[PDB]
Design an enzyme around this catalytic site. Structure first.
Site, mmCIF file in Angstrom:
data_model
loop_
_atom_site.group_PDB
_atom_site.id
_atom_site.type_symbol
_atom_site.label_atom_id
_atom_site.label_comp_id
_atom_site.label_asym_id
_atom_site.label_seq_id
_atom_site.Cartn_x
_atom_site.Cartn_y
_atom_site.Cartn_z
ATOM 1 N N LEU A 42 78.857 38.586 -0.176
ATOM 2 C CA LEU A 42 79.212 39.329 1.022
ATOM 3 C C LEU A 42 78.002 39.476 1.938
ATOM 4 O O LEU A 42 76.853 39.481 1.491
ATOM 5 C CB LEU A 42 79.754 40.708 0.649
ATOM 6 N N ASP A 43 78.272 39.596 3.237
ATOM 7 C CA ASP A 43 77.229 39.764 4.236
ATOM 8 C C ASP A 43 77.069 41.245 4.581
ATOM 9 O O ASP A 43 77.704 42.123 3.991
ATOM 10 C CB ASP A 43 77.538 38.929 5.481
ATOM 11 N N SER A 44 76.203 41.521 5.557
ATOM 12 C CA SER A 44 75.847 42.902 5.867
ATOM 13 C C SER A 44 77.052 43.700 6.351
ATOM 14 O O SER A 44 77.252 44.846 5.937
ATOM 15 C CB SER A 44 74.739 42.931 6.916
#
Ligand SMILES: CCCCCCCCCCCCCCCCCC(=O)OC[C@H](COP(=O)([O-])OCC(O)COP(=O)([O-])OC[C@@H](COC(=O)CCCCCCCCCCCCCCCCC)OC(=O)CCCCCCCCCCCCCCCCC)OC(=O)CCCCCCCCCCCCCCCCC
Ligand SMILES: CCCCCCCCCCCCCCCCCC(=O)OC[C@H](COP(=O)([O-])OCC(O)COP(=O)([O-])OC[C@@H](COC(=O)CCCCCCCCCCCCCCCCC)OC(=O)CCCCCCCCCCCCCCCCC)OC(=O)CCCCCCCCCCCCCCCCC
Ligand SMILES: CCCCCCCCCCCCCCCCCC(=O)OC[C@H](COP(=O)([O-])OCC(O)COP(=O)([O-])OC[C@@H](COC(=O)CCCCCCCCCCCCCCCCC)OC(=O)CCCCCCCCCCCCCCCCC)OC(=O)CCCCCCCCCCCCCCCCC
Ligand SMILES: COC1=C(OC)C(=O)C(C/C=C(\C)CC/C=C(/C)CC/C=C(/C)CC/C=C(/C)CC/C=C(/C)CC/C=C(/C)CC/C=C(/C)CC/C=C(/C)CC/C=C(/C)CCC=C(C)C)=C(C)C1=O
Ligand SMILES: CCCCCCCCCCCCCCCCCC(=O)OC[C@H](COP(=O)(O)OCCN)OC(=O)CCCCCCCCCCCCCCCCC
Ligand SMILES: CCCCCCCCCCCCCCCCCC(=O)OC[C@H](COP(=O)(O)OCCN)OC(=O)CCCCCCCCCCCCCCCCC
Ligand SMILES: CCCCCCCCCCCCCCCCCC(=O)OC[C@H](COP(=O)(O)OCCN)OC(=O)CCCCCCCCCCCCCCCCC
Ligand SMILES: CCCCCCCCCCCCCCCCCC(=O)OC[C@H](COP(=O)(O)OCCN)OC(=O)CCCCCCCCCCCCCCCCC
Ligand SMILES: CCCCCCCCCCCC(=O)OC[C@H](COP(=O)(O)OCC[N+](C)(C)C)OC(=O)CCCCCCCCCCC
Lengths: 88, 98, 51, 96, 347, 83, 99, 115, 175, 171
Positions: A42-44
């Protein structure tokens, strides 16, 4: 009567249940200790959505300062337990 | 008692069950209160007019005068209920006992 | 005699006055113009009305 | 101007009401004979309809007293035509 | 509220109750209740807080409903009798509607849920009017229609009131809910002897009003509305603790105090009518009332509950409240048993 | 007397409509007491015959009860005709 | 009344409208004036307990006038019997009952 | 009867015109045409939201003042009685009390709308 | 027929009571009370009282007009309920109609229904008076006596209305 | 409880007056002064007997004088009277005020031909006394025998024996 007491087993079930509904996390390699960024990929901003899903599951506001340190399912449970004083 | 009294008394019974069974709105119950007064007016007038009870012809008029006092008083309380909670729901009035 | 149902009950206020409830209802918002005779044609006067 | 005219209207009402009083004895007499005749027409037709009913007395009163009781509308126009009953009951209230 | 307006509203409460008591026409009896209800709501809503508004709304809905039943009974009475006189009702359905209507006004069980709430939601001074003056008009009507009242209906309402009032008060710590349930239980005695001897309904009513006025007045003197608040009285006005003790024991019906007079006289009349089971049940059931009066005595007079440091600042000021007739009402509520034969003045 | 004709002048300048109202309503409560014609309003109402004048049974000792409507006995409406 | 102030002071506040046989405007009678008079006069002074048993004839006449239950049933019986006959054509209406 | 026909005819004629209006013309319905009108821009909030009544106190007083016509309209008939002294006294008494009722609500800021 | 006009109005009178007794939005509840107040004028008007019929109708039109204003201010929600919007409202509406239907069906067939009271079904016209009055309306004479006979009724009713205005101001002052 | 007594269709039969309301109204004032005795005697029977069946014979004389009254108008004032009640008949309220010119002609024809005088305002409203040989009814209401009053308590009032006698109290 009084609602069932909140227990460390109950909180952990809720956290996994929320993350299971999320459509980006693969349920197979999802543990209570997997890191959101380095393991699930997952990204930010994906992590931000997860925190907001926790705000709805339980019903309390998680500020940005705290939400940045909750980088895996374990610390979310630790944070959730700390807020509700569920020592168990 | 002619068949008209059957429906006039049925109307009173309907409004009594209406008042005693609140849904949510306090205004809806006040209408049932005014509905009961309307039935009592028609029944009193029918009995009085049919028997030629001349002096009693003023009872229905006096009956309406105090009906609106209750209605006016009921609206005064409804104003203050809504000023506190934003709605006239009767489930908000559970601060006592509960 | 505490029981299950009366577990959530709380003692009333000392002076019988309950806290005023926070913001409950908002004002009505009205678009006044642009197609209004008194809006002078091209004014969108967004008014917040109470009554 | 209004008071003089309203006084003349009371003198005319008194004259109008005295005309009624002069006639009421005559109108009263006719009403008595019309009510008594209509009551006998009902009684006669009650004898020809309730002859076979076992426990029936024709023309029996419902009161213990033998005093004369003004008949209500049903007793007077009981077995009459619907239109005739309609005018007697609602003719006045519906006239405009 | 302007003092002039307050007096006028109070006199309209009295005028409404007086009209009921001097009227020979049902429409005037109904007008009396309407006028009484109109004037009583403002006094309930004089502190303007959410609880006061809730109490007034529940009291308006209950009393307006009973007024409709009262007028329906009157109109049915007119249909079957052609007259408006305040006397025995001439149709059984009319009698049931007016008996239930007057039970709702009094707060008798099972139409009792509003008494504990409305009293808790209004000031003590307003609660004194609700529990004492508002029983004068409904009882004055039950005193005139009792020959036509269904015996099973009136006695059933009395037994429930004694049971419900006795059981309800055991769970209370608030003094206004305690007096509300006490009122319900005492209403049962008044209407239980009504079929047999209405004079004992008046004697019980008068003693109850005197004792309830004494209790409320002493609660207003210290501005105490809870059990624990009443527990500090011994550190400010020890004299007020003894008077409270004597009145609570009186309300309990213990000899030689004045509260034993009505129960003693009601049992006599009922037994003369070969009613032995009911007085025995009523007398035993009243021990529930005595119990939660005894807890009040334990936490008010017979023990010294913990106090607070700021209590020392009240020792330097007098009791500036009026306490009208309190010295006279305490004597009447505890020292009238020797003058019991004076009840004949009520006949 | 100087002050009295200073409050009246102020209300007449700031609330003329209320000055007229209290004057009209005041005259409505006083004049009926002083009017000499208030008696005739009551006499006309009595003289209006809504009901039938049911006759009495002549027992021989009613000298002031007319035998015939056109007899001098009984009440007369001569005053009303000239009013 | 509970308190009979009206009797003490001799002032009629509301006893003028208690019964329909009292004075009415323009001497307008009520339909059951005679029956109410006979029942009121029968049961005066003797009390309510005696009047319930001794003025029962008058009170049954008075209630008959008020609601006309016995009268309506009798009209119902004649109406029902006539419908049966005219249904099977056994009774011929007279010229005045229908015209 | 004659009143029933007069009432029946008046409303039947009105109903026919409404029926004609909806069935005679050519129709072209789409969502934009039937959207609520608020001067060209979409409304913000439903029209069913609460709309405060700033003259509520006068509205309640209207009910109490609207009964007086019921008690005062019989005056023309009341003036036909033989007790004019009593009738006149109680007619003025009832109107005077209404004037006092208006005077009280006027001097106490009751006729002034809340802000 | 025209001989059952009062009964037909009384049925509509009840249906208007099942309208606001089901408790839909007070907008529609106030509509049923206007309907029942209009037929109520008709029923009272067919028994010989026209002033009473037009006065209750006149009074209840004023009240509902104020109630409409209050409803839009205190008793409104986003989706006002119609008689077909709630199973609770619809159940009460259908139950009231089916109960009126069976009362009408039995009182017209058997002509005799007994529920608490014995009711007859020979037509309301059977109880009317057969003697015409004089040159006046009896109801008008009775109401006109409020000022000559009902002096004590005028004082209490007059005082109540005055106290009514005082009372409502106190209740609504707040703060 | 008992059959209702009703006259047959031969005692209720009499020569009826078959003129309209405008004819009766146009001749009421003269009719109320010429046939006053027979019909004031009928009304006394009506109010005292309180029964239509007890005054049928008196009622027949009312129809008899009324017919005699109109026969005299038909012999002397036939034409002026016809022009009168036709003017009253035209108005929807049958007002007298709109036919005062015709009334004068009819009031003078009767005055000259018959000697009749029109009663002045208020005469027909008087309460008159009527001599009748008919006995005054006793118990016209058919009242039964009234119940006897309870024995009234007499004697002088003495103090209660031994006071109240309530339980142990000696006073
Ligand atoms: C058996 C016989 C035994 C009867 C027992 C009577 C004893 C009553 C207890 C005494 C009450 C008391 O101590 O006052 C505190 C208390 C004052 O309340 P608060 O919270 O301090 O403030 C009130 C206002 O906010 C204050 O606003 P404010 O300060 O700006 O000005 C308003 C002014 C207003 O002053 C008044 O009180 C007006 C007086 C009106 C009554 C006039 C007498 C009737 C003529 O203040 C007061 O209220 C004065 C204090 C109350 C004194 C009342 C003494 C007379 C009552 C006893 C006679 C009973 C008559 C019936 C009472 C009314 C029924 C509803 O008194 C009351 O308000 C209660 C009134 C009495 C109700 C109970 C009546 C007894 C019922 C049984 C009747 C038997 C027949
Ligand atoms: C029936 C006729 C019976 C005779 C009664 C006449 C006296 C009663 C009125 C006394 C009075 O003005 O105050 C009543 C009363 C005074 O209230 P309070 O606080 O109970 O009086 C004690 C104060 O310390 C009073 O102290 P204070 O400093 O305020 O003033 C001293 C007061 C001294 O006044 C007193 O002595 C008050 C105590 C007298 C008795 C009051 C209760 C009424 C007793 C009659 C009922 C007895 C029980 C019935 C029999 C049961 C046993 C069979 O002197 C006066 O006011 C002169 C009154 C003459 C005018 O005022 C009102 O309620 C409103 C007026
Ligand atoms: C009070 C009840 C006792 C309570 C005790 C606790 C028990 C509670 C449960 C109650 C049970 C039910 C009631 C008790 C049983 C009575 C049942 C019964 O059958 O009644 C018959 C009872 C006796 O009638 P009797 O048999 O024909 O006559 C007996 C003798 O021949 C005597 O008759 P006599 O005519 O020849 O002489 C009368 C005698 C009175 O009677 C007696 O003394 C004895 C006879 C009573 C019957 C026996 C009952 C047992 C209790 C005896 C109480 C001892 C009283 C003496 C106290 C010490 C003072 C010397 O002496 C006088 O008082 C002379 C008259 C004075 C004129 C007063 C004028 C008005 C001015 C008021 C001033 C107020 C004082 C201010 C003080 C200022 C101080 C600085 O009559 C009654 O119905 C009255 C019942 C109430 C008794 C009152 C007696 C005392 C009056 C003065 C009050 C002293 C305080 C009282 C004690 C309370 C302390 C907290
Ligand atoms: C300069 O800076 C600017 C402003 O600042 C000044 C601005 O403001 C604006 C904003 C711009 C605008 C508001 C528009 C600009 C242009 C204008 C013309 C408006 C400005 C000012 C005016 C004064 C224009 C006219 C205004 C009025 C009020 C004229 C009124 C005219 C009448 C005819 C009224 C009199 C009579 C009647 C009867 C009513 C008229 C209407 C009807 C529809 C009547 C007929 C109706 C019927 C229903 C007919 C009958 C039908 C039937 C079915 C019944 C008959 C049949 C039967 C069977 C019975 C801009 C852009 C601007 O730049
Ligand atoms: C002839 C003599 C007899 C005449 C009888 C007259 C009565 C006939 C019925 C007429 C209508 C009466 C008014 C309707 C009562 C009512 O308003 O119901 C209120 C209540 C509201 O419930 P709600 O908040 O909406 O939540 C639902 C969750 N279950 O609703 C509910 O609780 C559920 C729905 C109930 C619907 C049936 C209620 C009517 C039957 C009452 C019978 C009692 C008599
Ligand atoms: C027998 C029974 C018949 C009598 C009935 C008795 C009741 C009469 C009143 C009924 C009608 C209610 C009116 C009473 C209230 C009067 C108006 C009022 O109170 O206003 C108060 C007024 C406040 O105004 P403010 O803002 O302060 O600025 C002006 C400074 N005064 O400030 C004020 O001080 C008001 C100024 C004085 C007002 C005086 C009012 C007098 C009314 C009676 C006039 C009668 C005389 C007229 C008729 C004469 C004959 C032609
Ligand atoms: C005599 C007849 C007695 C009246 C019976 C008439 C039937 C009335 C019930 C109509 C249906 C109804 O009101 O709902 C059933 C109700 C449950 O409440 P409900 O509002 O349906 O909540 C779930 C959906 N919101 O459940 C009930 O309240 C049924 C009450 C019995
Ligand atoms: C319907 C039915 O059959 O039940 C009626 C029920 C029992 O009463 P009932 O029939 O009189 O007793 C048996 C005598 N045959 O009785 C009932 O359940 C009827 C309940 C009606 C609600 C009564 C509330 C008081 C209203 C008083 C007005 C008069 C009520 C009667 C008229 C309503 C019917 C039109
Ligand atoms: C929920 C709705 C309640 C029921 C509505 C009525 C229809 C069902 C009744 C069935 C039995 C029946 O046939 O009754 C019909 C009745 C009786 O009328 P009638 O003049 O005596 O007809 C019969 C006599 N004839 C033949 C001479 C005309 O009609 C009514 O006046 C009832 C009200 C009519 C509906 C008004 C509301 C719209």
């Amino acid at each position: 009567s009084d609602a069932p007491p909140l227990t460390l087993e109950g909180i952990k079930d809720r956290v996994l249940y929320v993350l299971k509904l999320y459509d980006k996390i693969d349920p197979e390699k999802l543990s209570v200790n997997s890191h959101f960024m380095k393991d699930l990929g997952l990204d930010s901003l994906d992590q931000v959505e997860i925190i907001m899903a926790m705000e709805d599951e339980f019903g309390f506001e998680i500020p940005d300062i705290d939400a940045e340190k909750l980088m895996c399912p374990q610390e979310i449970v630790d944070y959730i337990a700390d807020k509700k004083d569920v020592y168990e | 008692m002619s068949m008209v009294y059957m429906n006039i008394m049925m109307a009173f019974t309907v409004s009594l069950v209406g008042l005693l069974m609140y849904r949510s709105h306090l205004m809806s119950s006040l209408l049932c209160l005014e509905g009961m007064m309307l039935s009592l007016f028609v029944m009193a007038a029918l009995t009085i007019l049919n028997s030629h009870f001349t002096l009693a012809s003023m009872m229905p008029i006096i009956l309406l005068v105090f009906a609106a006092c209750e209605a006016a008083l009921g609206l005064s309380l409804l104003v203050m209920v809504s000023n506190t909670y934003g709605t006239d729901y009767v489930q908000n009035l559970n601060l006592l006992q509960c | 005699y505490p029981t299950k149902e009366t577990a959530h009950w709380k003692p009333p206020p000392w002076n019988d006055v309950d806290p005023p409830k926070d913001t409950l209802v908002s004002n009505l918002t009205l678009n006044f113009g642009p197609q209004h005779p008194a809006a002078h044609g091209v004014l969108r006067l967004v008014m917040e009305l109470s009554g | 101007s209004m008071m003089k005219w309203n006084r003349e209207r009371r003198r005319l009402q008194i004259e109008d009401f005295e005309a009624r009083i002069a006639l009421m004895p005559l109108l009263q007499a006719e009403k008595d004979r019309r009510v008594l005749q209509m009551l006998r027409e009902n009684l006669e037709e009650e004898a020809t309809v309730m002859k076979d009913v076992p426990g029936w007395k024709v023309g029996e009163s419902v009161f213990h007293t033998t005093r004369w009781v003004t008949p209500m509308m049903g007793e007077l126009y009981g077995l009459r035509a619907s239109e005739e009953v309609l005018s007697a009951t609602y003719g006045f209230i519906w006239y405009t | 509220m302007n003092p002039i307006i307050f007096i006028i509203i109070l006199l309209t409460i009295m005028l409404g109750t007086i009209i009921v008591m001097i009227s020979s026409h049902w429409l005037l009896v109904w007008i009396g209740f309407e006028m009484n209800m109109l004037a009583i709501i403002p006094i309930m809503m004089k502190n303007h807080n959410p609880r006061a508004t809730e109490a007034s709304t529940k009291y308006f809905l209950t009393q307006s409903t009973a007024s409709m039943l009262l007028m329906m009974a009157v109109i049915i009475n007119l249909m079957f009798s052609g007259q408006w006189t305040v006397m025995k009702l001439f149709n059984p359905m009319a009698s049931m509607l007016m008996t239930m209507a007057l039970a709702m006004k009094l707060g008798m069980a099972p139409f009792h849920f509003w008494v504990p709430e409305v009293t808790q939601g209004i000031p003590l001074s307003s609660g004194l009017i609700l529990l004492t003056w508002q029983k004068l008009a409904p009882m004055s009507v039950l005193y005139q229609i009792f020959p036509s009242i269904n015996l099973n209906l009136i006695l059933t309402l009395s037994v429930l009131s004694i049971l419900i009032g006795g059981w309800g008060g055991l769970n209370q710590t608030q003094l206004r809910k305690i007096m509300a349930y006490s009122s319900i239980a005492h209403m049962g005695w008044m209407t239980a002897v009504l079929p047999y001897n209405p004079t004992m309904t008046l004697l019980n009513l008068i003693i109850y009003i005197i004792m309830t006025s004494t209790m409320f007045t002493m609660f207003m003197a210290n501005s105490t509305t809870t059990t624990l608040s009443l527990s500090h009285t011994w550190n400010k006005t020890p004299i007020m603790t003894v008077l409270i003790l004597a009145t609570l024991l009186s309300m309990g019906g213990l000899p030689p105090l004045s509260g034993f007079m009505p129960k003693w006289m009601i049992i006599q009349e009922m037994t003369k009518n070969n009613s032995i089971i009911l007085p025995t049940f009523m007398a035993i059931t009243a021990l529930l009332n005595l119990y939660f009066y005894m807890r009040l005595t334990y936490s008010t007079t017979l023990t010294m509950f913990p106090s607070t440091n700021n209590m020392k600042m009240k020792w330097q000021f007098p009791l500036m409240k009026k306490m009208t007739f309190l010295p006279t009402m305490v004597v009447l509520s505890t020292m009238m048993l020797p003058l019991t034969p004076m009840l004949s003045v009520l006949e | 007397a100087e002050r009295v004709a200073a409050f009246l002048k102020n209300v007449w300048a700031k609330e003329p409509v209320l000055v007229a109202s209290f004057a009209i309503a005041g005259l409505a409560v006083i004049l009926p007491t002083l009017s000499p014609y208030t008696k005739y309003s009551l006499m006309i109402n009595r003289a209006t015959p809504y009901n039938y004048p049911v006759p009495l049974r002549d027992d021989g000792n009613m000298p002031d009860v007319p035998s015939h409507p056109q007899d001098p006995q009984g009440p007369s409406l001569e005053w009303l005709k000239r009013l | 009344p509970f308190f009979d102030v009206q009797k003490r002071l001799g002032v009629d506040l509301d006893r003028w409208m208690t019964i329909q046989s009292a004075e009415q405007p323009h001497k307008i009678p009520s339909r059951c004036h005679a029956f109410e008079k006979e029942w009121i006069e029968c049961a005066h002074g003797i009390g309510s307990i005696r009047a319930e048993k001794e003025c029962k004839i008058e009170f049954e006449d008075f209630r008959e006038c008020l609601l006309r239950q016995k009268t309506m049933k009798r009209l119902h019986a004649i109406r029902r019997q006539r419908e049966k006959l005219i249904k099977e054509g056994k009774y011929t209406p007279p010229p005045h009952h229908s015209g | 009867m004659n009143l029933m026909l007069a009432l029946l005819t008046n409303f039947t004629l009105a109903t026919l015109l409404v029926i004609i209006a909806f069935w005679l013309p050519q129709l072209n319905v789409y969502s934009e045409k039937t959207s609520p009108y608020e001067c060209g821009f979409d409304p913000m909030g439903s029209a069913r939201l609460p709309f405060s009544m700033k003259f509520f106190l006068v509205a309640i007083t209207f009910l109490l003042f609207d009964l007086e016509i019921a008690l005062l309209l019989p005056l023309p008939w009341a003036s036909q009685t033989a007790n004019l002294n009593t009738m006149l006294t109680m007619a003025l008494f009832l109107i005077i009390l209404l004037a006092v009722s208006l005077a009280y609500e006027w001097t106490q800021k009751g006729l002034e709308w809340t802000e | 027929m025209m001989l059952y006009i009062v009964f037909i109005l009384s049925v509509i009178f009840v249906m208007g009571f099942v309208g606001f007794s089901s408790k839909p939005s007070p907008i529609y509840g106030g509509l049923g009370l206007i309907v029942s107040g209009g037929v109520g004028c008709g029923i009272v008007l067919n028994f010989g009282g026209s002033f009473l019929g037009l006065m209750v109708f006149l009074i209840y039109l004023g009240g509902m007009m104020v109630v409409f204003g209050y409803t839009t201010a205190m008793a409104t929600e986003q989706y006002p309920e119609i008689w077909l919007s709630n199973k609770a409202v619809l159940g009460a509406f259908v139950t009231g109609l089916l109960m009126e239907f069976f009362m009408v069906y039995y009182v017209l067939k058997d002509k005799e229904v007994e529920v608490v009271f014995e009711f007859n079904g020979l037509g309301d016209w059977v109880i009317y008076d057969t003697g015409d009055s004089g040159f006046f309306s009896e109801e008008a004479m009775g109401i006109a006596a409020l000022y000559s006979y009902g002096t004590w009724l005028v004082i209490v009713t007059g005082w109540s209305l005055l106290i009514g205005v005082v009372v409502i101001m106190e209740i609504t002052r707040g703060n | 409880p008992g059959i209702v007594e009703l006259p047959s269709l031969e005692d209720l039969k009499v020569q009826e007056v078959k003129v309209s309301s405008s004819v009766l109204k146009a001749a009421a004032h003269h009719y109320g002064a010429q046939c006053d005795k027979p019909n004031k005697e009928f009304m006394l029977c009506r109010w005292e007997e309180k029964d239509p069946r007890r005054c049928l014979e008196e009622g027949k004389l009312v129809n008899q004088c009324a017919l005699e009254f109109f026969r005299q108008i038909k012999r002397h004032c036939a034409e002026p009277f016809t022009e009168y009640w036709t003017c009253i008949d035209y108005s929807g309220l049958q007002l007298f005020r709109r036919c005062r010119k015709q009334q004068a002609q009819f009031d003078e024809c009767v005055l000259d031909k018959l000697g009749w005088v029109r009663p002045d305002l208020g005469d027909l409203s008087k309460v008159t006394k009527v001599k009748t040989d008919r006995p005054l009814p006793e118990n016209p209401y058919h009242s039964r025998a009234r119940p006897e009053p309870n024995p009234e308590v007499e004697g002088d009032l003495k103090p209660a024996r031994h006071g109240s006698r309530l339980f142990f109290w000696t006073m």
